Amino acid sequence: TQLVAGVDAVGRGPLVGAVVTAAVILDPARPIAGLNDSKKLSEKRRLALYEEIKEKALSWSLGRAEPHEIDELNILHATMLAMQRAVAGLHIAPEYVLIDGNRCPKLPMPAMAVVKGDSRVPEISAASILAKVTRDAEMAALDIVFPQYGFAQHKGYPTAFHLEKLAEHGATEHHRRSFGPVKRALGLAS
Amino acid sequence: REELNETNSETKRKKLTKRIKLLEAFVQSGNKPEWMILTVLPVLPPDLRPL
DNA sequence: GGGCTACATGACGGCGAATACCCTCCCAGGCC
């Protein structure tokens, strides 16, 4: 109950890029504040928090899937194996794991899921902040490499802007080819 | 100006163009941003505020 | 001889910035 670790997954469904997950472990032997959630604050609010929790947590974790692997088992299998990988990556084992939702993987430690943990669990909130900042960094890198799509603007989500860009230019190797629009761009739709 | 040429949100563009208009107004004028902070406070002539 | 301490609550519209809400598609695996 003292080494409770909570993991969260952000960017589960953006058309482009792989998913990213984290798992930060923190106990009450240091000061934490301003980490209620991540989907209601500003980007700035998320830039200090990323670093704040990075140095306040004893351990920090990461994990990501691949476009082929994701499309090979959808966003219900890959997403789970990604957080399994993230838990595997933790330097120190956690006697308690938390996963936003009502579904749990096959893990050797007693993991369990809680719904809407992003606004009640500071752990899951911090993990979501870390994983979201890493997503934003990856999308910035891709938009630098691919400036013709505007990844850094909409974060590769299913917006009308993204739909029109994928209809005009097409899909690259990074796009998840198992979704609809992307299949409609190259003609794989039945 | 360089991030306005890349943003794609209407309200973001509006805020950016307002800020750019303010910055260009300051650049063109001889005004300085720090002049808003009053260090010397002038007073009205006594005849304009008589007793 | 001489200076100092410097509460209402009974107002209607509109417009424009500040946020809070419903667009926007796109995933699935148990219920119809």
Curated annotation (Swiss-Prot), chain B:
Disulfide bonds: none annotated. Acetylated on several lysine residues in the presence of glucose. It comes from the Bacteria. DNA-dependent RNA polymerase (RNAP) catalyzes the transcription of DNA into RNA using the four ribonucleoside triphosphates as substrates. Belongs to the RNA polymerase beta' chain family. The RNAP catalytic core consists of 2 alpha, 1 beta, 1 beta' and 1 omega subunit. When a sigma factor is associated with the core the holoenzyme is formed, which can initiate transcription. The rRNA transcription and antitermination complex (rrnTAC) consists of RNAP, NusA, NusB, NusE (rpsJ), NusG, SubB, ribosomal protein S4, DNA and precursor rRNA; S4 is more flexible than other subunits. This is DNA-directed RNA polymerase subunit beta'. It comes from Escherichia coli (strain K12). The gene is rpoC. The chain holds residues 202 to 252 of 1407 of the full protein.
